[PDB]
């Protein structure tokens, strides 16, 4: 996997 | 929203799973006919990948067809390679198939594939 | 094949295009009902994302249904957030919706979403 | 984009 897009 | 988190692998996983549905013939809703070779697929995947299928399946009459016959000049191996690319992101581009792949991608309106074919051909001359 | 090239952006582009089909209501083939809130979707996308919809639409009887009613304990906003995640890879996870998102992801069998919810909740305590 | 996967 999860990220800040 | 701006507060969203994103799962990097989600889009690729979705595509892998749509290809598993295709392999197991799950909820395929159209047969593409290419000089008597038949290919079962999902209209939504075909539309999401190709300008030609997007125009076909947004037509008020053609959207209801369960069989679509492509132009007889279209090469079935070329179509098969492009159908695999649609469902996997992978293009089996080879010296012996590049002309048919490029011709089929131009017909299907798949600009990214056309671009890479033009690059591979220009490098060979 | 081992000679394949790959278009990095293809999977994400396909997903963006499937979400455009959903937004324009193109070839949507099921209505998901959540406590009288209705959501139009594509069975293949739902199956590719959720263990619950995969079990539903591979059933020989349920595969033919155009309407699926979810358990009344399921929260419609929680479902909506998960349906948007399915079509975009983006999860609008907020303090005020995390419990309903986690409960809905457990029901829908979406393990990656369950995992991130458990991490965000454990960090808050 | 195109890459060797
Ligand atoms: C090769 C892509 C074909 C395509 N696929 C689509 N799937 C959903 N919408 N959609 C549209 C679309 C519309 C605007 N921006 C992005 C794509 C097109 C399209 O305009 O094709 C011409
Ligand atoms: C949350 C994923 C749900 C899912 N989606 C699928 N789409 C196509 N096949 N498919 C299967 C599948 C089968 C084996 N390996 C990968 C996924 C499953 C599945 O087994 O669900 C249980």
Q: Which helix (H) or strand (E) holds B68?
A: strand B67-69
State whether the beta carbon of B47 lies less than 6 angstroms from ligand 1.
Answer: yes
Ligand nearest to the CA of C82: 2
Question: Which of B46, B50, B51 has most ligand 1 atoms within 8 Å of its beta carbon, as the pocket-test mutant?
Answer: B51
As a whole number of angstroms, the distance between CA C68 and CA C32 comes to: 5
Instruction: Quote the domain boundaries for residue C41.
Output: 1-125
As a whole number of angstroms, the distance between CA B40 and CA B27 comes to: 10
What's the longest Cα–Cα distance across chain C?
Answer: 51
Q: Touching check for B3 and chain A: CB below 8 Å? A: no
Nearest-CA residue for atom 5 of ligand 1: B48
Nearest-CA residue for atom 20 of ligand 2: C51
Number of residues in chain D? 5
Burial class (CB in 10 A: 0-12, 13-18, 19+), B50: buried
Nearest to B77 by CA among B31, B35, B119: B35
State whether the beta carbon of C69 lies less than 6 angstroms from ligand 1.
Answer: no
The tokens describing C19, both together, are 């979400």
Determine, for residues D2 and B90 on separate chains, whether the beta-carbon distance falls below 8 Å. Answer: no
How many domains are contained in chain B? 1
Say which residues have a Cβ less than 8 Å from residue C88's Cβ, sequence separation at least 6.
C15, C16, C19
Q: Are C86 and C45 in contact (CB under 8 A)?
A: yes
Residues of D in contact with C4 (CB under 8 A): 5
Nearest-CA residue for atom 19 of ligand 2: C51
Q: Is C95 left (phi over 0), alpha (psi -120 to 50) or beta?
A: alpha
As a whole number of angstroms, the distance between CA B19 and CA B13 comes to: 10
Comparing alpha-carbon positions, the chain C residue that sits nearest to A1 is C112
CA distance A2 to chain C (A): 8
């Amino acid at each position: 996997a999860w990220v800040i897009p | 929203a701006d507060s969203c988190i994103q799962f990097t692998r989600h889009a690729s996983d979705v595509l892998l799973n749509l290809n598993r549905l295709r392999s197991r013939d799950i909820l395929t809703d159209v047969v593409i006919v290419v000089s008597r070779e038949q290919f079962r697929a999902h209209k939504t995947v075909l539309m999401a990948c190709s300008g030609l299928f997007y125009s076909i399946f947004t037509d008020q009459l053609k959207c209801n067809l369960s069989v679509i016959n492509l132009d007889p000049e279209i090469n079935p191996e070329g179509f098969c390679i492009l159908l695999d690319f649609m469902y996997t992101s992978r293009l089996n581009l080879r010296e012996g198939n590049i002309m048919a792949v490029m011709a089929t991608a131009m017909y299907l309106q798949m600009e990214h594939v056309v671009d890479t074919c033009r690059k591979f051909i220009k490098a060979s001359e």
